[PDB]
Each structure stands twice: as structure tokens, then as C-alpha cells.
Amino acid sequence: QCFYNESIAFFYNRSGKHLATEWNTVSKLVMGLGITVCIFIMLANLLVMVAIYVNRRFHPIYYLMANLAAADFFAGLAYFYLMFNTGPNTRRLTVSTWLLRQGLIDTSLTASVANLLAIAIERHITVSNRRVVVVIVVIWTMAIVMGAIPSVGWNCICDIENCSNMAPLYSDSYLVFWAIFNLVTFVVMVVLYAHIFGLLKTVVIVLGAFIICWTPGLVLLLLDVCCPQCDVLAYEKFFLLLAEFNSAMNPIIYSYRDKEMSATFR
Ligand SMILES: CCCCCCc1ccccc1CCCCC(=O)N[C@H](CO)COP(=O)(O)O
């Protein structure tokens, strides 16, 4: 029993979500903060890629740093397009277009997370251009397939009853998958960096950015998929902004230590 016939209104009304036909103080506030964060991400990551390409000094570690910067740039673009599509604007959507929006978000953040794990793995190995391009194509292939799987097959077009409260169309199975994927990625980063340490400031801030910008989102998604009657829609719009603020901080987290890169920035 599968229904692509209904519009977004049917799916929201099925769920607990609110369409927000009219503009709001909260809607204007989140639009302003989101556009600010997106402008910051785009500018900062454009600067990082320009530097990593202008200097022959940063010609594999800096390739993975620039790949992380490009994924964060894509996250900025995805979040920028998600804005100018919220509040009353969401009411103008269709199933295909809304899936476009959420798929861009999925692939962008998955690419950012995979680049963080790849930089951790390279740092572990360090402690030609073959392994670096192999891991870049693995990161991008995994990001695209992860952002496309719900857009094709893995969503609640067919089970209205069994899917999420926040994403009315993604399923509890997909949200559990994404969140456990991110959780195991974070524990792999923690074990790699702890083994490396066994420097403390760099490790703590690198893990801390990730924990304070993801644990909110991941615990929120697990609550949505596990606990009924846990009012979890309330703190969604700001937790996504925190997840994008992670990609905002990544360019200065992974470029502050390099005095050469600091001198480069011009
Ligand atoms: C697609 C799932 C990927 C995995 C989770 C991503 C994530 C992380 C941290 C906070 C939130 C999320 C997504 C939550 C839904 C996406 C959205 O845009 N929600 C907002 C919540 O107010 C409504 O968007 P809209 O209804 O205004 O279009």
C-alpha cells in the first residue's frame, strides 16, 4: 500500500508537524542565522580551498583537508537551499523537490563526517596519490549513495505507520541507520585518536567539536525512532543549525595549527 498521490500537507498532517503558512519571528530568526552560517561556511571553505590550491606547500593530508573543506562547502550550499524553503515556503514543495532538499543535506553531512574519519585514519597512519584519491572517491561514493538511498527505496512512501516524526517520509530504519553510522564513526575517531595519544589540546578540541555539534542531533534522532511521546520536534530547527555550525568550525579547527596556513591566509 504505497501513496505518492498525496502532497506535503497530507504527510505533515499525518505526522505531528506544523506547516506554518504565515511568517514568524522564530522563522525570520532561523532564516537570518542559517543564511549567516551558510555565508560563513561558503566564504571560509572557499578561502581554505583557494589556499590549499595556491600553495605547492600543501600539495595527501592537505588533499583530504581540502576535500573536507569542499564537503563543508557543499553542506553550506545544501543548508542555504534548505533556507528559502522553510516556513511558509515549505508549503510550496512537492515530494520530489522535498526529497531533493533532504538528499542534498544527507549527502553533504555524510561527506563531512566521512572526511573527518578519513583525516583521522590518515593521521593514525602517519603517526604517492593512490590511497588519498581512493579514500576521496570512497567518501564521495558513500556520501552520494547515502543521500540517494532514501530518495529511491528506503522511505515510508509504502509504510505510513512506521516512519519518523520529523522527516515525515524518511523511515525509523533509515534514521537509526544514519545515526548508528555516525555514532560508530565518532567512536572510531575516538579510538584512533586515543591510540595516537597513547597534542592533547588538538585531540580534545577535534573530538569536542564533533561531540558538541553531533550528540544533540544523534540523541534527538534516536529519541524520535525509539521513544513514543517524547516531544522531540521542539529542538529540531536549532540542532540542525548546530550540525551545520560544525561544518562552519571545521575549516578553522583543521587550519589553526598550521602557522604556514595562518601566514598563507591573504
Ligand atoms: C534527513 C535526515 C538526515 C539525518 C538527520 C539530520 C538532522 C540533524 C540534526 C537536526 C535535524 C536533522 C534533520 C531533521 C529534518 C530536516 C529539517 O529540515 N528539519 C526541520 C526542523 O524544523 C524542518 O524543515 P522544514 O520542515 O522547515 O522544511
Side-chain angles (χ1 to χ4, degrees), residues 94-113:
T94 46
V95 172
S96 61
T97 311
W98 175 53
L99 271 163
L100 168 71
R101 208 183 52 179
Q102 302 311 135
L104 291 177
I105 290 290
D106 291 330
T107 184
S108 65
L109 294 175
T110 301
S112 160
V113 163

Side-chain angles (χ1 to χ4, degrees), residues 12 17 82 85-87 90 93 98 101-102 105-106 109 166-167 170 174-175 178 214 217 220-221 233 236-237 239-240 243:
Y12 283 171
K17 199 139 176 211
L82 194 168
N85 291 318
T86 52
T90 189
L93 270 183
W98 175 53
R101 208 183 52 179
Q102 302 311 135
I105 290 290
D106 291 330
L109 294 175
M166 319 203 195
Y170 291 15
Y174 179 75
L175 273 302
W178 199 71
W214 280 112
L220 175 148
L221 293 171
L233 309 94
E236 176 179 3
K237 173 150 264 183
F239 281 16
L240 183 62

Side-chain angles (χ1 to χ4, degrees), residues 179-205:
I180 296 171
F181 165 95
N182 191 358
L183 185 78
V184 298
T185 294
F186 171 69
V187 306
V188 163
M189 285 179 49
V190 167
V191 175
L192 293 183
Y193 272 129
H195 196 188
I196 282 170
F197 186 88
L199 200 69
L200 187 61
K201 299 304 269 155
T202 298
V203 168
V204 170
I205 71 166

Side-chain angles (χ1 to χ4, degrees), residues 127-129 131-140 142-160 162-163 165-197:
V127 161
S128 77
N129 291 317
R131 284 306 148 180
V132 65
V133 303
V134 159
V135 297
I136 295 170
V137 305
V138 165
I139 293 168
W140 274 118
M142 185 194 330
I144 299 300
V145 72
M146 270 300 314
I149 282 298
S151 169
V152 168
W154 205 267
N155 64 5
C156 77
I157 301 299
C158 286
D159 274 332
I160 300 302
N162 294 112
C163 69
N165 296 321
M166 319 203 195
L169 275 298
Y170 291 15
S171 166
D172 300 331
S173 49
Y174 179 75
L175 273 302
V176 155
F177 186 70
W178 199 71
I180 296 171
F181 165 95
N182 191 358
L183 185 78
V184 298
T185 294
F186 171 69
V187 306
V188 163
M189 285 179 49
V190 167
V191 175
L192 293 183
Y193 272 129
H195 196 188
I196 282 170
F197 186 88

